[PDB]
Structures are given as C-alpha cells and as structure tokens.
Design a protein around this ligand. Structure first.
Ligand code: ZN
Length: 258
C-alpha cells in the first residue's frame, strides 16, 4: 500500500506518511501576478542543453521520466536566481483528465492542461541524493502546457508511450533534444519551494516560465492512455497526477520581468 493520486491515497493523505507535507515551503503554489515582486537584480536564465544526453524513458507508476546522463556537465542550468551549476537529471509532466486541469502551479488561479518539470541538481553536492537534503539543492524549471497547436519537438516522446504503458516499464530513449520543449521567452517567476511528490523535501528553487507552450489535443490524449498500475493488474488510467496549490506562508514570489 502506498501514496498516489487516488481517492484513498491522494495528496490530502500524504501528510500521514510525510509530515513535511504541511511544511513552511511546500509546492506548488498559486502565482498571484499582481502580488509578485519585480526584482531587477534577477539575471536572465542560462540554459545550456546543446550537449544533453538522454538515455531512457521510464513509467515509475506516477509519471513518466525522461532520464539524462548527469555524470558530467552536459546539460546545465545557470543564472537566474541560482548560484552555481545545476545539472539536468530528468524531466516529467503532470496532467489532467480534462483540458481544464492538470498543472500544479496556477497563475491567478488559472489551471493549465499540463505542466512540464525539468529537474536539475546543484553540482556542489556531488550527487542527486545529497542535493535533495540541501535548501539550495535542486532547481526545477516549470513550463505550462496549453492545448492548441501541436508541438513538433514533443512528438518523439508521445510516440514511445505505448511501449511504457504500465508501471516499471522502461525503453531506450537516446538523442532527444530538450531544447525543442522551451517557449520563445525565458521570462520567469521564482520562489523557494519543495518537491511536489513524496518525500516533498524543501530543497527546490522553482523557476516557472511565464510563457506556455502549446500542444495538440491528440498529443495530450496519448498521455492519458498511460497506466498507474503494473502489467497484469487492474487498469487505472494515469490522469490527474497533480498536487493542488499549497499555502504560500512566509514566501515572496519574484518576477524577472514587468
Ligand atoms: Zn513534477
């Protein structure tokens, strides 16, 4: 038995196994655009993804993760509110059962159809397991998805999902370029927060991009055909794997733009 997004084990239950769920710097949050503070000292993001090496795609029972080689500085995030170099280790999505929901963050209470998380860890801590124990250990780039036009650079991911339908399945996934998932503008909001899945550690600098990317209804439809369950178990569609907004408490959201 274990956490998930169902009626008996979803986000409202997580605090019993993970008391940090009611902590002071939980994610996601609603981004109130009129209350966010423009901060001129914020630097532009530096995304260096030209030498990225993707390796594998995995259904972990809660999402699917595209994994990268993070044994060297190949795909890194620098700049913005960050000090130091953060290496890309994996990206994943959260999505809904319907187009009107699915994102984790919201903007002026608006929900998007899905949210992309590019997860990076701070190289000064040596490995990902050490980094998540540190308040400045991770940086996650969050990108909203809206339904409209198709996203050409997402199609290679959509076409492999049939091969990892059920929990624990993986497939080789080499030569994927994550630059094809970025919006035109890199303007962002940032705040200190947490992982949005157990163990919910408060180790994340969130960088949430203002500009959404567009994907087609057929693309997001294929996400909704994945399964939470393992092969041979009763079928439960992988939908609504998002955590709702958490109280902002003593935090300020900063904007890189006006
Ligand atoms: Zn996530």
């Amino acid at each position: 038995h274990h956490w998930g997004y169902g009626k008996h084990n979803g986000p409202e239950h997580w605090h019993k196994d993970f008391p940090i769920a009611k902590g002071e710097r939980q994610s996601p949050v609603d981004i109130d655009t009129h209350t966010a503070k423009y901060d001129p000292s914020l630097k532009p993001l530096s995304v260096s993804y030209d030498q990225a090496t993707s390796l594998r795609i995995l259904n972990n029972g809660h999402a699917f993760n595209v994994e990268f080689d993070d044994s060297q500085d190949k795909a890194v995030l620098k700049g913005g509110p960050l000090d130091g170099t953060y290496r890309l280790i994996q990206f994943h999505f959260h999505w809904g059962s319907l187009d009107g929901q699915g994102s984790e963050h919201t903007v002026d209470k608006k929900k998007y159809a899905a949210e992309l998380h590019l997860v990076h860890w701070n190289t000064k801590y040596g490995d990902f397991g050490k980094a998540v124990q540190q308040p400045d250990g991770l940086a996650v780039l969050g990108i909203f998805l809206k339904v409209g036009s198709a996203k050409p650079g997402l199609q290679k991911v959509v076409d492999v999902l049939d091969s990892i339908k059920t929990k624990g399945k993986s497939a080789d996934f080499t030569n994927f370029d994550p630059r094809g998932l970025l919006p035109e503008s890199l303007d962002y909001w940032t705040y200190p927060g947490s992982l949005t899945t157990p163990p919910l550690l408060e180790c994340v600098t969130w960088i949430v991009l203002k500009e959404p990317i567009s994907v087609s209804s057929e693309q997001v439809l294929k996400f909704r055909k994945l399964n939470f369950n393992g092969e041979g178990e009763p079928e439960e569609l992988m939908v609504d794997n998002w955590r709702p907004a958490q109280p902002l408490k003593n935090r300020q959201i900063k904007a890189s733009f006006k």
